[PDB]
């Protein structure tokens, strides 16, 4: 089997991407944030505290003839941005782009933190990291990809995120029309539950490439590119007037600037992030200070190849017995 679904930016900055997902019988379609940095499929629901729902579409398990309470199971998750959610668990039929999994754990939110409530466009998350990170207790549950894998034509999914435009998540096949050149594959460590890999270096604009190992995670659920402070300083030094602002929470730059590109290495290959992809617009409405799309990871504990980086590439998440990542230009 295969599946193919379009993923759409939630706003004009590509702050996140939503993908329609069918849950239950008859189908209830919710727009989920596919997140290769976590491993829970959770949804706003008829059980979510009413004051914490503000425009999202909810899953109502009592209206699904295939929903079954997973007795005793609870979940609770906290994300790198400080947001969180928790609740109980049903199993139900879940389909993405024509690919159907029966018995998928659908984690129903009883509580969500303010940032989820405040974002009316995201009805939940669909985790695509390794199932060892799933938070369901006392019986950990498998991701949608893990459940679908054995049925897929090939045990892979691909992320093709657009810049200010829709893109595609495919399951079970590699669309050879979706990228240019060849796909360069690189080793993955699953030891932290992430799609963790080592970039071979970077360049700023037309500058020379610096060969240096940068361990990080391919994370479609993170907006920006978070890299070591040395790398980030070298980037922003090429932008007149750019500075790190403690009050804003990162590097800012004059909105009048033209930003240089940023290149990252994948083995001997190179992925170029155009400068425009690094512009996240005014820090507040009407400001002439703009927020940068490349930020320091120094306070995170891990480097994160978020959407800024991934949307410059066609990315293969290879879930073979020894997982690997592939990157192609497009």
Coordinates of C-alpha atoms in Angstrom, one line a residue:
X1 CA 0.0 0.0 0.0
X2 CA 0.9 3.7 -0.2
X3 CA -0.5 7.0 0.9
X4 CA -0.1 10.6 -0.4
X5 CA -1.4 13.7 1.3
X6 CA -0.9 17.4 0.8
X7 CA 0.5 19.4 3.6
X8 CA -0.3 23.2 3.8
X9 CA 1.3 26.0 5.8
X10 CA -0.9 27.3 8.5
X11 CA 0.1 31.0 7.9
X12 CA 2.1 33.3 5.7
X13 CA 5.3 32.5 7.5
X14 CA 5.2 28.7 7.3
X15 CA 5.1 28.5 11.1
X16 CA 3.8 24.9 10.8
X17 CA 2.1 22.7 8.3
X18 CA -1.2 20.9 8.5
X19 CA -2.2 17.6 6.8
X20 CA -5.8 16.3 6.7
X21 CA -6.3 13.0 8.5
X22 CA -9.4 10.8 8.6
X23 CA -10.2 9.3 12.0
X24 CA -13.0 6.9 12.8
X25 CA -16.2 5.6 11.1
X26 CA -17.7 7.6 9.5
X27 CA -14.6 9.6 8.9
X28 CA -13.9 12.7 11.0
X29 CA -11.3 14.8 9.2
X30 CA -8.9 16.7 11.4
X31 CA -5.9 18.8 10.3
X32 CA -2.9 17.5 12.1
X33 CA 0.7 18.7 12.5
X34 CA 2.9 15.9 11.2
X35 CA 5.9 15.9 13.6
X36 CA 9.0 13.8 13.0
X37 CA 10.3 15.0 16.4
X38 CA 7.6 13.2 18.5
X39 CA 5.7 10.0 18.6
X40 CA 2.2 10.6 19.8
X41 CA -0.9 11.0 17.6
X42 CA -3.1 13.3 19.7
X43 CA -6.2 15.3 18.9
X44 CA -8.5 17.9 20.2
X45 CA -11.6 16.0 21.2
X46 CA -15.1 16.1 22.7
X47 CA -13.2 15.4 26.0
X48 CA -11.0 18.5 25.8
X49 CA -11.7 21.1 28.5
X50 CA -14.2 23.4 26.8
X51 CA -12.4 26.7 27.7
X52 CA -9.2 25.3 26.0
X53 CA -10.9 24.8 22.6
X54 CA -11.0 27.9 20.4
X55 CA -11.9 27.0 16.8
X56 CA -10.2 23.6 16.4
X57 CA -12.1 20.7 14.9
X58 CA -12.6 18.0 17.5
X59 CA -12.6 14.2 17.4
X60 CA -15.8 12.7 19.0
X61 CA -15.1 9.1 19.7
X62 CA -18.7 8.4 20.7
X63 CA -19.7 9.1 17.1
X64 CA -17.2 6.6 15.7
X65 CA -18.5 3.0 15.4
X66 CA -14.9 1.8 15.3
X67 CA -13.6 3.7 18.3
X68 CA -12.7 1.7 21.4
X69 CA -11.5 3.1 24.7
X70 CA -8.0 1.8 25.5
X71 CA -8.8 0.9 29.0
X72 CA -6.5 2.5 31.6
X73 CA -4.3 4.2 29.2
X74 CA -3.2 7.9 29.7
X75 CA -0.8 10.1 28.0
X76 CA 1.0 13.4 28.8
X77 CA 3.6 15.2 26.6
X78 CA 5.7 18.3 26.8
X79 CA 7.4 19.8 23.8
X80 CA 10.6 21.7 23.3
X81 CA 8.7 25.0 23.0
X82 CA 7.2 24.5 26.5
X83 CA 3.7 23.5 25.3
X84 CA 2.0 20.4 26.6
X85 CA -1.1 18.3 26.4
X86 CA -2.6 15.2 28.1
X87 CA -5.5 12.9 28.2
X88 CA -6.8 9.3 27.6
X89 CA -6.6 7.0 24.6
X90 CA -8.9 5.3 22.1
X91 CA -8.0 3.0 19.2
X92 CA -9.7 3.7 15.9
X93 CA -9.2 3.6 12.2
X94 CA -6.9 6.3 10.9
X95 CA -6.3 7.1 7.2
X96 CA -3.7 9.5 5.7
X97 CA -3.9 10.2 1.9
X98 CA -5.6 6.8 1.2
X99 CA -3.4 4.7 3.5
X100 CA -5.4 3.1 6.4
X101 CA -4.3 1.8 9.7
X102 CA -6.8 0.0 11.9
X103 CA -6.3 -0.1 15.7
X104 CA -4.3 3.1 15.7
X105 CA -3.9 4.7 19.1
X106 CA -5.7 8.1 19.0
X107 CA -4.8 10.1 22.1
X108 CA -7.7 12.2 23.1
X109 CA -6.7 15.5 24.8
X110 CA -8.4 16.3 28.1
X111 CA -6.1 19.3 28.6
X112 CA -3.9 21.4 26.2
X113 CA -1.6 24.3 27.0
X114 CA -2.4 27.8 25.9
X115 CA -0.3 27.8 22.7
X116 CA -2.4 24.9 21.3
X117 CA -5.7 26.6 22.3
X118 CA -4.5 29.9 20.6
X119 CA -3.7 28.1 17.3
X120 CA -7.1 27.4 15.8
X121 CA -5.6 25.8 12.7
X122 CA -3.9 22.8 14.3
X123 CA -6.4 20.1 15.5
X124 CA -3.6 17.9 16.9
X125 CA -0.3 16.2 16.2
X126 CA 0.7 13.1 14.3
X127 CA 4.1 11.9 15.6
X128 CA 6.5 10.3 13.2
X129 CA 9.6 9.8 15.4
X130 CA 10.4 6.4 16.8
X131 CA 7.7 4.7 18.9
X132 CA 10.1 4.5 21.9
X133 CA 9.2 8.1 22.5
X134 CA 5.5 7.5 22.7
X135 CA 4.1 8.7 26.0
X136 CA 1.1 6.4 26.5
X137 CA 1.2 4.6 29.9
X138 CA 1.1 1.9 31.0
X139 CA 1.4 0.3 27.5
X140 CA 3.4 2.3 25.1
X141 CA 1.7 2.7 21.6
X142 CA 3.1 2.7 18.1
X143 CA 3.1 5.6 15.7
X144 CA 1.0 5.6 12.5
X145 CA 4.1 4.9 10.5
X146 CA 5.2 2.0 12.7
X147 CA 1.7 0.5 12.4
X148 CA 1.5 1.0 8.6
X149 CA 5.1 -0.1 7.8
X150 CA 4.6 -3.8 7.2
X151 CA 1.8 -3.0 4.7
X152 CA 3.7 -0.3 2.8
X153 CA 5.3 -1.1 -0.6
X154 CA 8.5 0.2 0.9
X155 CA 9.1 1.0 4.6
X156 CA 9.5 4.8 4.1
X157 CA 7.8 8.1 4.2
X158 CA 8.9 11.4 2.6
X159 CA 8.5 15.0 3.5
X160 CA 8.3 17.6 0.7
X161 CA 7.5 20.8 2.5
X162 CA 6.8 23.9 0.5
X163 CA 8.1 27.5 0.9
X164 CA 5.0 29.6 1.2
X165 CA 3.2 26.9 -0.7
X166 CA 1.7 23.4 -0.1
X167 CA 3.8 20.3 -0.2
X168 CA 3.4 16.5 0.2
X169 CA 3.8 13.7 2.7
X170 CA 4.1 10.3 1.0
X171 CA 4.0 6.9 2.6
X172 CA 5.4 3.8 1.1
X173 CA 7.1 5.1 -2.0
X174 CA 9.6 7.6 -3.3
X175 CA 8.2 10.0 -6.0
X176 CA 11.1 10.3 -8.3
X177 CA 9.5 13.3 -10.0
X178 CA 9.6 15.3 -6.8
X179 CA 13.3 16.1 -6.6
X180 CA 16.3 16.9 -8.8
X181 CA 19.6 15.0 -9.0
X182 CA 20.0 12.1 -6.7
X183 CA 19.1 11.4 -3.0
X184 CA 22.0 11.2 -0.6
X185 CA 21.4 8.9 2.3
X186 CA 23.1 9.3 5.7
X187 CA 23.2 7.3 8.9
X188 CA 20.6 7.7 11.6
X189 CA 21.0 7.1 15.4
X190 CA 17.7 6.0 17.0
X191 CA 19.3 6.1 20.5
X192 CA 17.3 9.2 21.6
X193 CA 14.2 8.2 19.6
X194 CA 14.7 10.9 16.9
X195 CA 15.7 10.9 13.3
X196 CA 19.2 11.9 14.4
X197 CA 22.0 12.3 11.9
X198 CA 25.2 14.2 11.4
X199 CA 25.6 17.0 8.8
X200 CA 29.0 17.3 7.3
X201 CA 29.2 21.1 7.5
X202 CA 27.9 24.4 6.3
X203 CA 28.5 27.5 4.2
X204 CA 27.1 31.0 4.5
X205 CA 26.0 32.7 1.2
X206 CA 28.7 32.3 -1.4
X207 CA 31.3 31.6 1.3
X208 CA 33.6 28.6 1.4
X209 CA 32.2 25.4 2.9
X210 CA 33.3 24.5 6.4
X211 CA 33.7 20.8 7.0
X212 CA 32.5 20.1 10.5
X213 CA 30.2 17.4 12.0
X214 CA 26.9 18.8 13.3
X215 CA 24.7 16.2 15.0
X216 CA 21.0 17.0 14.9
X217 CA 17.5 15.8 14.3
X218 CA 15.2 16.1 11.3
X219 CA 12.1 17.6 12.9
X220 CA 9.2 18.6 10.8
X221 CA 7.4 19.8 14.0
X222 CA 9.9 22.6 14.6
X223 CA 9.7 25.8 12.6
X224 CA 13.3 27.0 12.6
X225 CA 16.8 25.8 12.1
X226 CA 18.7 25.5 15.5
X227 CA 22.4 25.1 15.2
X228 CA 25.5 25.7 17.4
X229 CA 26.2 29.2 18.4
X230 CA 29.4 29.4 16.4
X231 CA 27.6 28.5 13.2
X232 CA 24.7 30.9 13.9
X233 CA 27.1 33.7 14.7
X234 CA 28.9 33.2 11.5
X235 CA 25.6 33.4 9.6
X236 CA 24.3 36.5 11.1
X237 CA 27.6 38.3 11.0
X238 CA 27.0 38.5 7.2
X239 CA 23.8 40.6 7.7
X240 CA 24.3 44.2 8.5
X241 CA 22.6 45.2 11.7
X242 CA 21.7 41.7 12.8
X243 CA 22.1 41.0 16.5
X244 CA 21.0 38.5 19.2
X245 CA 18.3 40.1 21.3
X246 CA 17.7 38.6 24.8
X247 CA 14.4 40.5 25.1
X248 CA 13.1 39.1 21.8
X249 CA 14.6 35.6 22.3
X250 CA 17.0 35.2 19.4
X251 CA 18.7 36.8 16.4
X252 CA 16.8 39.7 14.8
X253 CA 17.8 41.6 11.7
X254 CA 16.6 44.7 9.8
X255 CA 13.6 43.9 7.8
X256 CA 15.2 45.9 5.0
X257 CA 18.0 43.3 4.7
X258 CA 18.5 40.8 1.9
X259 CA 19.5 37.6 3.6
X260 CA 22.3 35.3 2.4
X261 CA 21.6 31.6 1.7
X262 CA 22.7 28.9 4.1
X263 CA 24.1 25.6 2.9
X264 CA 24.3 22.4 4.9
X265 CA 26.2 19.2 4.1
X266 CA 24.7 15.7 3.7
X267 CA 27.7 13.5 3.1
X268 CA 29.4 14.9 0.1
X269 CA 26.1 16.6 -1.1
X270 CA 24.9 20.1 -0.3
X271 CA 21.4 21.5 0.4
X272 CA 21.0 25.2 -0.1
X273 CA 18.5 27.1 1.9
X274 CA 17.6 30.4 0.1
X275 CA 18.0 33.5 2.1
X276 CA 14.2 34.3 1.9
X277 CA 13.5 31.1 3.7
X278 CA 15.3 32.5 6.8
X279 CA 13.0 35.6 7.1
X280 CA 10.3 35.2 9.7
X281 CA 9.0 38.7 9.5
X282 CA 8.5 41.5 11.9
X283 CA 8.9 40.6 15.6
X284 CA 5.6 42.4 16.3
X285 CA 3.1 43.9 13.9
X286 CA 4.6 46.9 12.1
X287 CA 8.1 46.5 13.5
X288 CA 11.1 47.0 11.2
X289 CA 13.0 44.4 13.2
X290 CA 12.6 40.9 11.7
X291 CA 13.0 37.5 13.4
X292 CA 15.7 35.2 12.0
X293 CA 15.0 31.6 10.9
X294 CA 18.4 30.4 12.0
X295 CA 18.8 30.4 15.8
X296 CA 21.2 29.1 18.4
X297 CA 20.6 25.6 19.8
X298 CA 22.9 26.4 22.8
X299 CA 19.9 26.4 25.2
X300 CA 18.2 23.3 23.8
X301 CA 20.7 20.5 24.2
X302 CA 20.3 19.3 20.6
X303 CA 20.6 20.8 17.1
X304 CA 17.3 20.8 15.2
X305 CA 16.9 20.7 11.4
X306 CA 13.4 22.1 11.5
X307 CA 11.2 23.3 8.6
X308 CA 13.5 26.1 7.5
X309 CA 16.1 23.4 6.5
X310 CA 13.8 20.6 5.5
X311 CA 11.6 22.6 3.2
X312 CA 14.7 23.2 1.0
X313 CA 14.9 19.5 0.4
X314 CA 13.0 16.4 -0.5
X315 CA 13.5 14.2 2.6
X316 CA 13.3 10.5 2.9
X317 CA 12.6 8.9 6.3
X318 CA 13.8 5.4 5.6
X319 CA 12.3 3.0 8.3
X320 CA 14.1 -0.1 7.1
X321 CA 15.6 -2.4 9.8
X322 CA 18.5 0.0 10.0
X323 CA 16.9 3.4 9.5
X324 CA 18.5 6.1 7.4
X325 CA 17.7 9.6 6.1
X326 CA 17.9 10.8 2.5
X327 CA 18.1 14.3 1.2
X328 CA 17.7 15.6 -2.3
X329 CA 17.6 19.1 -3.8
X330 CA 14.3 20.0 -5.5

